[PDB]
Amino acid sequence: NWLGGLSRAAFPKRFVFGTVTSAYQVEGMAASGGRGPSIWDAFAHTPGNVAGNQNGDVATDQYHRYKEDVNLMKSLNFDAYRFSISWSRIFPDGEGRVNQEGVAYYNNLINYLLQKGITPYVNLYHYDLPLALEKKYGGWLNAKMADLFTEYADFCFKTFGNRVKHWFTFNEPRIVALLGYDQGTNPPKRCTKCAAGGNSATEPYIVAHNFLLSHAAAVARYRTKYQAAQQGKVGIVLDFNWYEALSNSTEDQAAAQRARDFHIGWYLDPLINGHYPQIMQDLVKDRLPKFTPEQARLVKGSADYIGINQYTASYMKGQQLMQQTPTSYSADWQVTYVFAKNGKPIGPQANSNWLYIVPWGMYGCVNYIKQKYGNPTVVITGNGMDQPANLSRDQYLRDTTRVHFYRSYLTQLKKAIDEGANVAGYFAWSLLDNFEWLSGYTSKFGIVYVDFNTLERHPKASAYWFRDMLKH
Ligand SMILES: OC[C@H]1O[C@@H](O[C@H]2[C@H](O)[C@@H](O)[C@H](O[C@H]3[C@H](O)[C@@H](O)[C@H](O[C@H]4[C@H](O)[C@@H](O)[C@H](O[C@H]5[C@H](O)[C@@H](O)[C@H](O)O[C@@H]5CO)O[C@@H]4CO)O[C@@H]3CO)O[C@@H]2CO)[C@H](O)[C@@H](O)[C@@H]1O
Ligand SMILES: [Zn+2]
Numbered sequence: 001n002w003l004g005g006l007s008r009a010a011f012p013k014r015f016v017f018g019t020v021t022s023a024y025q026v027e028g029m030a031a032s033g034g035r036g037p038s039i040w041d042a043f044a045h046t047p048g049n050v051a052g053n054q055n056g057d058v059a060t061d062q063y064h065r066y067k068e069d070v071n072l073m074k075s076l077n078f079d080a081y082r083f084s085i086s087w088s089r090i091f092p093d094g095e096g097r098v099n100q101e102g103v104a105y106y107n108n109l110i111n112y113l114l115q116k117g118i119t120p121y122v123n124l125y126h127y128d129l130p131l132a133l134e135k136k137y138g139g140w141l142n143a144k145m146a147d148l149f150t151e152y153a154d155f156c157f158k159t160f161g162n163r164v165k166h167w168f169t170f171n172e173p174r175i176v177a178l179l180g181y182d183q184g185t186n187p188p189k190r191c192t193k194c195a196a197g198g199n200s201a202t203e204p205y206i207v208a209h210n211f212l213l214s215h216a217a218a219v220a221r222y223r224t225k226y227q228a229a230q231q232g233k234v235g236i237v238l239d240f241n242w243y244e245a246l247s248n249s250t251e252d253q254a255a256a257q258r259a260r261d262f263h264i265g266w267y268l269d270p271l272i273n274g275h276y277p278q279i280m281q282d283l284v285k286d287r288l289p290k291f292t293p294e295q296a297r298l299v300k301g302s303a304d305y306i307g308i309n310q311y312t313a314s315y316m317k318g319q320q321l322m323q324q325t326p327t328s329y330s331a332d333w334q335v336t337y338v339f340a341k342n343g344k345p346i347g348p349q350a351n352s353n354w355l356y357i358v359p360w361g362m363y364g365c366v367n368y369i370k371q372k373y374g375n376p377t378v379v380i381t382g383n384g385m386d387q388p389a390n391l392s393r394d395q396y397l398r399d400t401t402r403v404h405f406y407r408s409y410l411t412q413l414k415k416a417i418d419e420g421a422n423v424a425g426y427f428a429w430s431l432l433d434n435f436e437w438l439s440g441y442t443s444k445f446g447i448v449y450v451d452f453n454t455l456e457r458h459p460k461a462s463a464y465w466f467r468d469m470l471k472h
Helices: 039-044 062-075 100-115 131-137 145-160 173-182 203-230 250-273 278-287 293-299 360-372 393-397 400-418 437-442 461-469
Strands: 016-020 080-084 119-123 166-171 233-239 242-245 306-309 313-317 336-338 378-382 423-429 448-450 457-459
Touching: 016 119, 016 378, 039 131, 062 100, 062 457, 080 166, 080 423, 100 119, 100 145, 131 145, 145 166, 145 203, 166 203, 173 203, 173 233, 173 250, 203 233, 203 250, 203 293, 233 250, 233 378, 242 250, 242 360, 250 278, 250 293, 250 313, 250 360, 306 360, 313 360, 360 378, 360 400, 393 448, 393 457, 400 423, 400 461, 457 461
Parallel strands: 016 080, 016 423, 080 119, 119 166, 166 233, 233 306, 242 313, 306 378, 378 423
Antiparallel strands: 313 336, 448 457
């Protein structure tokens, strides 16, 4: 049967199923409703930065259509919705004056979700730093971000936390560090060779450190000021794609483990264990900032659950570890990526070149966190795949590859849960086709098709698959 034996009965009692969007990717009204610009508004409005010079000015216009979209997710039998608050929609300058119209939008959205029995899971940040903070403070290179983010978080807790009980601070800080400060392809476009300036060997580490310190400061504020009354939880969302040793050689096993540590351990060792991974300390040395004992104690245990965005897997080949002149966070890993073993590709690619369809990577990642980190509460906060541009409406709707994707990946997640992994929920990226960053509207991740000419929603086969799977 097309469900492959999956249903709510196949997952733990009270297991949460949801869909996910982010503010800039779906809201629209980017320069309206009092919203100030983010670093992504400036970036996307610069010719050449995004596919087709597209931007999020309108996106899916969820800002006007949110009741349609909430009705849809309820009709598809989801329990929860992960979305983000745009910092610059609340504080157009990132600090100071509150945009009451922006506050009203999120109140209306939260209230409608609750009215319809959908639990809000709310990210405070999803790549969309207020442009004013980038210009005034230098964004995530500045340790002052911990104060600025904490004050923003405090406002959100105060304003929405009587209703919102499930928060995340950040979304995929690794990707901000990597694309914004190593490769320099995402805002602020910093890197060693970059026009904007930068240093690919140092800045990614500074940025990650400031995300960890800012997360910890915001959670300390929640716990000391809001938790007693509100009795909610705050976590963080981290991307983790799987790394599998190419062979059982000591060298290849070491490489796959180094990759895991530089990818997920970079954040999870501080959050769970109060230190960076040993291998990062050993290889990155003076370029890796040091937590003081007090900071480490603030960071350790500061996530009530770990959000994991899981998409793909790679084979890793090793090499003898060498003394080398530092060049980048990426090069520091001293690994070699491989996408075939014994002449066979690890899996077929979705539209995005990086996204190999490898359902056993889901098991790999979840089992690994279970075994390495004392089985922390994990929520799969994003998982999905994309179709390419230029298909017909009907071609988008007949998304049989995505149906197969969800059935296979969820079977692998179930395998890990059945083996004892402490996974509390699962969220599909994305509810809607949306603005896919550098790919603009040329990458379609939704279980619901969005016609970007008319803005009409049409559920795809995968949406109906979820509806059938999730029926109560
Ligand atoms: O995107 C959908 C949705 O999901 C969330 O976040 C996504 C995010 O949007 C993506 O940008 C991001 O993509 C990264 C991949 O996950 C990751 O595997 C990939 O890793 C690269 C690595 O950075 C690079 O060094 C390496 O290059 C080597 C080549 O492979 C070799 O051929 C060559 O010889 O050597 C070079 C250098 O060693 O390749 C690897 C493998 O691709 O980096 C991607 C960044 O482009 O994934 C996120 C989740 O994983 C997000 O929540 C939503 O907002 C978003 O819309
Ligand atoms: Zn509109």
